[PDB]
Every structure is written in C-alpha cells, then in structure tokens.
C-alpha cells in the first residue's frame, strides 16, 4: 500500500468526518439567529456536502460568525481532500510513465 493511496483513503475518511461534525456544528451555530435556514441536520448535511465540493447552489448558507467559521473548515477540508486525490492520481500516472520509459 503506497502513501498516496493511503493518503487518499485517510483524506476521504477525515472529510466524511468534517462533513458530519460540520453539519452538527452549523445547526448549533445558526439556531438563535433570526432568518437563519441552516437549522436542521438533514439539510445541514446536504449544505456541508455542497460546500465541501464548492458547488454552493445558494439554497443554504450560514449567516452567523460561527457558522461561517464552520463553513470555512468544510470548504478547506473539501478543496484540500479532492486536491489530494488529484495528486495521488498524478503520482500514479508518473510512476507508470517512468516504467513505460523503462527507467
């Protein structure tokens, strides 16, 4: 088992973690702020997913300071995790291209 593949897995596990913790923390942070919509777990989990992937439709988003802070962690964990997979794929292509180079 290579580091990049182990890193991919780990990245995926930690991301699913951030998503769950993030969903829980967003609701905890938004309830109390009038006009807030990120206030029930099911949709918060949906919000966290569309945030980690950067799709951000705009149907949901935090309006409080703590919610936004939670949002930042989720964005970063998502961007960074997916970028990690990209780097793992680059390593896999490079390694095989060297082989095919008989190097």
């Amino acid at each position, epitope marked *: 088992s290579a580091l990049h593949w182990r890193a991919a897995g780990a990245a995926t596990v930690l991301l699913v973690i951030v998503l769950l913790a993030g969903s*829980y923390l967003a*609701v*905890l942070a*938004e*309830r*109390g*702020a*009038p*006009g*807030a*919509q990120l*206030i*029930t*777990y*099911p949709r918060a989990l949906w919000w966290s997913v569309e945030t980690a992937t950067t799709v951000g439709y705009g149907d949901l988003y935090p309006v409080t300071l703590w919610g936004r802070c939670v949002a930042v962690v989720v964005m970063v964990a998502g961007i960074t995790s997916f970028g990690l997979v990209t780097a793992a794929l680059a390593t896999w292509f490079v390694g095989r291209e060297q082989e095919r180079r008989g190097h």
Partner: antibody
Amino acid sequence: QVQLQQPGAELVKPGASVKLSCKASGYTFTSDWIHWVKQRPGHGLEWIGEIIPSYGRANYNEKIQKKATLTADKSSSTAFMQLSSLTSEDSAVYYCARERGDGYFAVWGAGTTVTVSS
Amino acid sequence: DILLTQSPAILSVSPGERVSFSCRASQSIGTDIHWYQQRTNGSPRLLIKYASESISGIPSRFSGSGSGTDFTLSINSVESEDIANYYCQQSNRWPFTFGSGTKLEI
C-alpha cells in the same frame, strides 16, 4: 411509554419564581432539542425557547420578554425551565416537546399548569 | 420572523364532509410546515409533517398539501373525534413559529 413527564401544576406568588421540569424517556440522540411552549387559556401556542442537552446551548423567542432560563441535566435526562418574577400574565399551561433536530415536535409533555396568585 | 396565518379561525362542516384547513406563510418556506391536533384539555399531537408526510398512527383520513406559502390540512369525511383545534408550524427559518389555529366544528 410516556416520552416526556411534566408535573401537573405549580402555584407561584407574583414576583416569585418557579423551575419546571420535563423528564424524558425513549430514544435520546445528541441531536435532540427540547422545546418549551406557552399556552394561555383560550389563546394559542407560543414558542418560548429551546435547548440542546448534549451541548447545553439555549436560544429564546426574542419576540417576548425573557422570563425563562433553560438548563438540562444530561445524567437524569431532565430539562428545566426557570421562570422568574412572574405576574398573572405568566399564568398558563407550559409544555415541553422533543424535536429530533428536523423541525417538528414529534412528542409533547402533558404540560404544567402554572398559576400566579397570592 | 415568519408569520403563519390560519384563515377562518372556525370551520363548520356536516358529518362525513371533506374539510380543508388553510395555513399561509408570510414568505416562501418550501415544504417545512407541520400540523398538530389539540383536543379540549389535551396536549398537541403531530398529524402531518413536511406539508404532506403521513405520521404513523394517524387515521388515513388526514392528509396535507401545498408548498411555498399556501398549505392545506384535509380531513376526508369528518367525524366527532376530529373536533379540536388545528395548528400549523414552520421550521424553515429561525424563530420556529405557530399559526393562530383553526377550530373544527361539526
């Protein structure tokens, strides 16, 4: 079995204060929120506030005068609502309800009848 | 804060008729509306969640419909046991709120 247990009544002198309780049973998830609702005779349902025991955070209906203070005892699965310095306007039936964090009140207590009088 | 308007505060129907309760929101709230029944001296009881989802243990007689700002709670074929107060509640934005309620009369 009864998921939320509330005392039937509490008599309180104007100016004084009381602490209502709401003991719970059945499934309890970290995502549960306990709500409190006020109902004056004849009138409708008024939301007072909520509390999430697993964290202890509490929010209140900022539309009305803050008479309550919510707390919870994780160990005995009991939520408490302290009403302070009451007047006859505070006389009413006070309900507690459990929401699984998905927006609706799946279950309600029988409610505690509070009467403010000398 | 979201305002919930329950039209005729009182509704009169003959035994067996189909009856419809109205609930209107001051702004669009998707399907995040719930209905409760409260009989004389009883505590509220969930009947419909999310505008039209059935609740276990509730007569098939009851159903809900709508989305956006207009919601309806319907009772197909009214009967004595349905005499009570009916309330809607929203969970779309924060201060969860209740409608003023509608009394059913047969």
